[PDB]
Amino acid sequence: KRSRKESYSIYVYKVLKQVHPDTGISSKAMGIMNSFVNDIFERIAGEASRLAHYNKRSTITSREIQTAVRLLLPGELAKHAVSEGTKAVTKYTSAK
Amino acid sequence: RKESYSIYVYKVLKQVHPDTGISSKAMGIMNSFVNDIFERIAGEASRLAHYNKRSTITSREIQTAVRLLLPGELAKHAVSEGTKAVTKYTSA
Amino acid sequence: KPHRYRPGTVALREIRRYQKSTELLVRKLPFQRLVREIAQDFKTDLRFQSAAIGALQEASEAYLVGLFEDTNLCAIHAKRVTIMPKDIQLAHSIRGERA
Amino acid sequence: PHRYRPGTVALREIRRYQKSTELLVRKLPFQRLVREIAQDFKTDLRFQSAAIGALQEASEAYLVGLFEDTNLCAIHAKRVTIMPKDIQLAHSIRGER
Amino acid sequence: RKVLRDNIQGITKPAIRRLARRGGVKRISGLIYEETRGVLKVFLENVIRDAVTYTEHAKRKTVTAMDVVYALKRQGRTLYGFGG
Amino acid sequence: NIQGITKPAIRRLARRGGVKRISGLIYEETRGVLKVFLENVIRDAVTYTEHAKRKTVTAMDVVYALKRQGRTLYGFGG
Amino acid sequence: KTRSSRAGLQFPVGRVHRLLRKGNYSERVGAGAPVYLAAVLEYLTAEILELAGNAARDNKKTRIIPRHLQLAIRNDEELNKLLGRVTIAQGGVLPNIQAVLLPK
Amino acid sequence: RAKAKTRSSRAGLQFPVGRVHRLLRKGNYSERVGAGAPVYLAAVLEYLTAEILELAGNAARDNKKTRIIPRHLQLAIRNDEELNKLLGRVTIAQGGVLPNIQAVLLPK
DNA sequence: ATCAATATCCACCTGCAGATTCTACCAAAAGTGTATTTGGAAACTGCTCCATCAAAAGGCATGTTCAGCTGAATTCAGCTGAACATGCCTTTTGATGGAGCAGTTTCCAAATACACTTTTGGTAGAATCTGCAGGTGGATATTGAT
DNA sequence: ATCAATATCCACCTGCAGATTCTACCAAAAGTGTATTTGGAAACTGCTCCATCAAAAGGCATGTTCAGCTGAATTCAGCTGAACATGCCTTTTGATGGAGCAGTTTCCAAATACACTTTTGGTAGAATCTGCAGGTGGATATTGAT
């Protein structure tokens, strides 16, 4: 009699308050945002899946995700996403 | 190293056209055709199983994928052929 | 007199109006009936979640709105301002929907 | 003193080139252009011949297709002469613009 | 229940006109409305066909918003806002 | 280098596309389109090269790049 | 005794199975799926080869080349829909000249 | 044992690294997933969320509202060259279109 | 270069639907301790790549000449937009039963996971053969012109 | 049109060669046979949502009139792009050596899967909060007649 469905709304809302601390988001707009995250997740992961396969490699590393990001995103968006991801990975491996 | 669908394309060629040959460039076209359709069918059946939270791609996923991917009257015949191969295979 | 806007003026008023808003432009109940009719002629005894009908209307209207932009470009390219079936067919053809 | 009327040889060339499948851009100039463009992304690269051939086949198929849509746009405007605004209209409707 | 017939005609002339307006169209020839109905009907057949195929494959009798969302993704018309 | 893509060669491509008469500005418009096409495809291909840690663009790198761009090519490995 | 001969197919069932498992499509793969999929790939292969053999014969040729695969695909409504985003290398295009462009 | 740190906090991120790791293992993308791949991907997803919400909030401000609705998302996407290309095949329900009237249509 | 008719703002107002925050258990993260890989980091092949070098020709660049196509200018029949009257049917609020999703359990037919035995399909030297491209010779197509 | 003449094009054969087809033999898959795991079909069933109904009301659909101005036809002349002969240069073609370098083979230390045992972070609702949709009125345009 109970059943539960995950979402990115919690983390969307946090990042929202970081950029516009005064601003809310209606559930319809949060709906869009959830579609966006799930979409890009699947495009990155799917391209990463293919990259690994083309190279007879059974593992998706941060290096795959990074090539996928460079193939999927244009111009400045790619440069900045590559920065954030590299930074996050080194911070994570520095145990930081 | 480097397997191909060539010998199987050639066998099917002799069945439908025992008089006819095939250039190596044409044989490459056919290889590209088979890998493409293979990935489209497999890719869709993969989605079908994930959507319905299954871990197994069965011929039911392949058939719906074919229905979803092939223009009707190629899906009809493909569904025929596939059903027929699965029964002939199970009966033995 | 009575007062009377010249042909073309209300049309531009309406482009500005509907380009400003986001509400659906086809009526809900008629569209729900179209969907149930097409669906039934494909499989019988089907039921629809209301959001499924809403998703189809959102997509169907986003598609037609997008097609009329392309159609409008084809009209203007012919040095007209009146969209005609030639334009929809030319747009549709180049879109690769059906070459 | 023999001379063909304008459009007559052109139609003749349409029939000739719609009949054949040979590449229509010369191979070396194209290889130069591929390597020049590629040099701006990664330096000191080498190309399989089959990679150059793939690119030239993709590239000529793309251009031939785009000339078909361009031709249709010129016909739509009551002309028989393709113009840049025809290429632009096709490129835009195709959702590459 | 009750026979469904000719419902394409409930896509009225004023509804097609408003949609042209959002699309930036100023003048509309009188033959546009029947061409639009035809184009809409092909669009809906193809999407409803794939959606219902997702339904049948799940052994359901109810077409869900997910079914329609997957149908549209198949067709390269990805939709945001019904992914629930 | 792109001027090496010549007027008569652009005529020939137009002819296979069914074109009877060509405005004199088509040739430069065509070279610009061809260059965007090659940049997009080659950029993707070299990204597959570099990922593979190679110095040689392979035909498969092009085929994968064309597939990403919705321009699937048959005859060179898929 | 192979699974292909058992399914009555020229196409390799065992290979289609190994490619499904190693292609990261699902965790598990039923036994009929490589049979079904292999039958579908063989059928569509036969359809193209038939039409392309015809295009060879109608050209006074006995060896199928890329041009004949192109004329088979493009002259068939359904193969054309299925392969409408595919480029067949060395296939060329169908002869076709818009009426408006013809003489007189 | 030690007190538990989330891998997000280790990564300096708002988005859930552990969940992204689980969605990778479950999504049938490869046999194995490295430790840095969910970190890098949760980072890219949060950066893109941040860039969209930045421009959406601005549109909300320009329209004198404090709650982002789909319109604001749509204006943010369509007006940014790069989001518009990233999402040029996507439909945002209830987003409408950009005000745009071809010049030749305006009163002569 | 003005009124008049009408549409468009824009700010100020108020509770209702719709957010944003507050609680409370579970699934799903994180910790920790072992058991397999992985795929890099070296080394040394053999391919296939690039770089010349030198011919010849096929092809492109160039300039002339004019044919005919594009575009500008003008007309006008009638299509389509604006405005109006009229009243239908969609929209909205609100029940109701019950179809059919979705959630728990329970558990065989069908799947993975080994460890061996045969088999086939990919290689690389051996064997014909299809059609390219080049002869002729004969109508066909085009274009000028009593 | 069915006059004379230029070029195009189309069939029919013809013989050397570049690709095909066919012969001959060794690893890596594919097939078996045992022995497990487990996924998800089958069987009550809780309980969301879907189809349907009623009923009242005003937003819109429908049809009509009327004429503004748009599309479509026609004409015309300048000038752009096609056809062409001319002549030279860049492309093509091709054994030659050399070398960069994919692709292999041998490890092993870092990194991943695994696996139960504990800890939260997030979800599903109750509870508390508040933008703004929608209703009204004057600035301030905007449009179109005179």
DSSP string, C20-73: H--S--S-HHHHHHHHHHHHHTTSSS-EE-HHHHHHHHHHHHHHHHHHHHHHHH
Tokens 């073309």, residue located: C8
Q: Among partner residues H95, H100, H101, which is closest to C22 by beta-carbon distance?
A: H95
DSSP for chain G? Answer: --HHHHHT-SS-HHHHHHHHHTTTS-SEE-SSHHHHHHHHHHHHHHHHHHHHHHHHHTTT-SEE-HHHHHHHHHTSHHHHHHTTTEEETT--------GGGS--
**Under the phi-then-psi rule, with left for phi > 0, alpha for psi from -120 to 50, and beta for the rest, what region is C73?**
alpha
Minimum Cα–Cα distance from B31: chain F residue:
F78
Non-local (6+) Cβ contacts of H38 within 8 A are H7, H17, H18, H20, H21, H24
Q: What is the CATH number of domain E1-84?
A: 1.10.20.10
Distance CA F31, CA E5 (A): 53
CB H83 within 8 A of CB H76: yes
Instruction: Kindly provide the b/e burial profile for residues E20-45, where b requires at least 16 CB atoms within 10 angstroms of the residue's own CB.
Output: bbbbbbbbbeeebbebbbebbbebbe
CB H60 within 8 A of CB H74: no
Question: Is E23's CB within 8 Å of H97's CB?
Answer: yes
Amino acid occupying residue H44: V
- Please count the other Cβ atoms lying within 10 Å of the Cβ belonging to residue G17: 19
- Cβ pair C27, E15 in contact under 8 A: yes
- Chain A residue nearest residue F61, CA to CA: A54
Instruction: Tell me how close the Cα of G57 comes to any Cα of chain B, in angstroms.
Output: 9
Packing angle, helices B24-51 and G33-57, rounded to 10:
150
Query: Is residue C33 within a helix (H) or strand (E), and if so which, with residue range?
Result: helix C28-40
- Cα separation, F14 vs B29, whole angstroms: 25
Please report residues of G whose CB lies closer than 8 A to that of F76.
89
Say how many C-beta atoms besides its own lie within 10 A of residue H107's C-beta.
7
What CA–CA distance (Å, rounded) separates B45 from B48?
5
- Whether A2 and chain H come into contact, CB under 8 Å, resolves to no
Q: Does H88 touch chain A (CB under 8 A)?
A: no
Count of domains observed in chain B: 1
C-alpha distances out from residue C7 to B34, C10, C12, E27, G87, Å? 58, 7, 10, 10, 48
Give strand letter and number of the nucleotide nearest C78 (CA to C1').
J71
C-alpha–C-alpha distance, residues C65 and C91, integer Å: 13
Question: A24-25 and H67-68 as β-strands: parallel, antiparallel, unpaired?
Answer: parallel
- Whose CA is closest to C89, among C79, C97, C80, C77? C97
- Measured over the CA atoms of residue C46, residue C50, residue C53 and residue C55, the dihedral's sign is negative
- Backbone torsions φ then ψ of H69, nearest 5 degrees: -115, 170
Q: Under a CB-based contact definition with an 8 Å cutoff, are residues H46 and H39 in contact?
A: no
| Identity at G12, one-letter amino acid code | P
Q: Which domain holds residue B18?
A: 1-92
B68–chain E Cβ distance below 8 A for any pair? yes
Report the alpha-carbon distance of residue A11 to residue G7 in Å, rounded. Answer: 52
- Would you call the peptide bond into C2 cis, given omega within 30 degrees of 0 as the criterion? yes
Q: Domain limits of chain C?
A: 1-99
Amino acid present at E24:
G
User: Contact E79/H91, CB-based, under 8 Å?
Assistant: yes
Contacts of A31 in chain E (CB under 8 A): 80-84
Q: Name the DSSP class of E83.
A: -
Q: DSSP letters along D26-61, please?
A: -HHHHHHHHHHHHTTTSSS-EE-HHHHHHHHHHHHH
| Residue pair A28/H69 in contact by the 8 Å Cβ criterion | yes
Phi, psi (degrees; rounded to nearest 5) at H90: -115, 145
Q: How far apart (Å, rounded) are the C-alpha atoms in residues E57 and E73? A: 17
Q: Phi first, then psi: what are they for G31, rounded to 5°?
A: -80, -25
Q: Residue C98, SS3?
A: coil
Gap from D23 CA to I123 C1', Å:
32
Contact E21, C19 (CB under 8 A): yes
Distance CA E24, CA C83 (A): 11
- Cβ of E83 and A35 within 8 Å? yes
| Strands annotated E in A9-94 | 24-25, 59-60
The CATH homologous superfamily to which domain D1-97 belongs is: Histone, subunit A (1.10.20.10)
Cα separation of A35 and A92, whole Å?
27
Q: Give D36-43's long-range contacts (Cβ < 8 A, gap of 24+).
A: D36/F1, D37/F35, D37/F38, D37/F39, D37/F42, D38/F42, D38/F46, D38/F57, D41/F42, D41/F43, D41/F46, D41/F47, D42/F46, D42/F49, D42/F50
Cβ–Cβ < 8 Å for C87, C81: no
Compute CA distances G94 → C97, F17, F72, G70, whole Å: 19, 10, 19, 8
End-to-end CA distance of chain B: 32
C-alpha R_g of chain G: 19
End-to-end CA distance of chain H: 79
- Using CA atoms in the order H33, H34, H35, H38, what is the torsion angle rounded to 10 degrees? -50
Burial of residue D28 (CB within 10 Å: 0-12, 13-18, 19+) is: exposed
Beta strands in chain H (DSSP E): 32-33, 67-68, 90-92
Sign, Cα dihedral of B65, B66, B72, B76: negative
- One-letter amino acid at C52 equals A
Our measurement of CA E39 to C1' J40, in angstroms, reads 42
3-state secondary structure of E63: strand
Contact B64, E53 (CB under 8 A): yes
Pairing of strands C82-83, E27-28: parallel
- Which residues of chain G have a CB within 8 Å of the CB of D54? 89
Query: Phi and psi for F73 in degrees, rounded to 5?
Result: -115, 130
- In Å, how far from its chain's centre is CA A22? 25
Whether the CB of G24 is below 8 Å from some CB of chain A: the reply is yes
* For H74, nearest residue in chain C (alpha carbons): C22
Amino acid identity, position H81: E
What is the spatial distance between Cα A54 and Cα D72, in angstroms, rounded to a whole number? 40
Domains identified in chain H and CATH numbers:
1-108 (1.10.20.10)
> Gap from B28 CA to J24 C1', in Å?
26
Are F76 and F59 in contact by the 8 Å Cβ rule? The answer is yes
Which residue in this structure is represented by tokens 């965007």? F36
Could you tell me the end-to-end alpha-carbon distance of chain F, in angstroms, rounded to an integer?
30
Quick check: G26 contacting A, CB < 8 Å?
no
- Give every CB contact of residue G100 below 8 A, 6+ residues apart in sequence: D75, D80
Residue A31's domain is classified under what CATH number? 1.10.20.10
Strand I lies under 7 A from the Cβ of residue B1: yes
Q: Experimental method used, please?
A: X-ray
Taking a C-beta distance cutoff of 8 angstroms, is the pair E25, C83 a contact? yes
| H or E, element range at A33 | helix A27-54
CB C8 within 8 Å of CB H107 = yes
- The listed CATH number (3.40.50.720, 3.40.50.2300, 3.40.50.1820, 1.10.20.10) that belongs to domain C1-99: 1.10.20.10
Token pair belonging to C76: 């203007």
Q: Do residues F35 and F2 lie in contact, with contact meaning Cβ atoms separated by under 8 Å?
A: yes
For CA atoms B20, B22, B23, B26, the dihedral sign is positive
Query: Read out DSSP for B20-49?
Result: -EE-HHHHHHHHHHHHHHHHHHHHHHHHHH
* Amino acid, res. F27: Y
Q: Would you state the structure tokens that stand for residue A12, as one six-digit string?
A: 């969307």
Residue in chain B lying closest to E47 (CA): B68
Level-2 CATH architecture, domain F1-78: Orthogonal Bundle (1.10)
Nearest to H28 by CA among B49, A18, E29, C11: B49
Contacts of F69 in chain G (CB under 8 A): none
Neighbours of chain D (3+ CB pairs under 8 A): C, F, G
**Cβ within 7 Å of strand I: which of F 2-61?**
6-9, 21, 56
Q: Do chains C and A touch (3 or more CB pairs under 8 A)?
A: no
* Test mutation, H24, H28, H29, chain G, max G CBs within 10 A: H28
Across the interface, whether the CB atoms of C93 and D72 are under 8 A apart is answered yes
What is the spatial distance between Cα F58 and Cα F78, in angstroms, rounded to a whole number?
Answer: 13
C14, two tokens = 């309406």
The domain locations on chain F are 1-78
**E53: exposed, middle or buried (Cβ count in 10 Å: 0-12, 13-18, 19+):** buried
On whether the CB atoms of residues G37 and B62 are closer than 8 A, the answer is: yes
**Proportion of chain E in helix, strand, coil states, percent, rounded to 5:** 60, 10, 30
User: If residue E79 lies in a helix (H) or strand (E), which one and from where to where?
Assistant: strand E78-80
- Residue G86 sits at φ, ψ, to 5 deg, of -115, 140
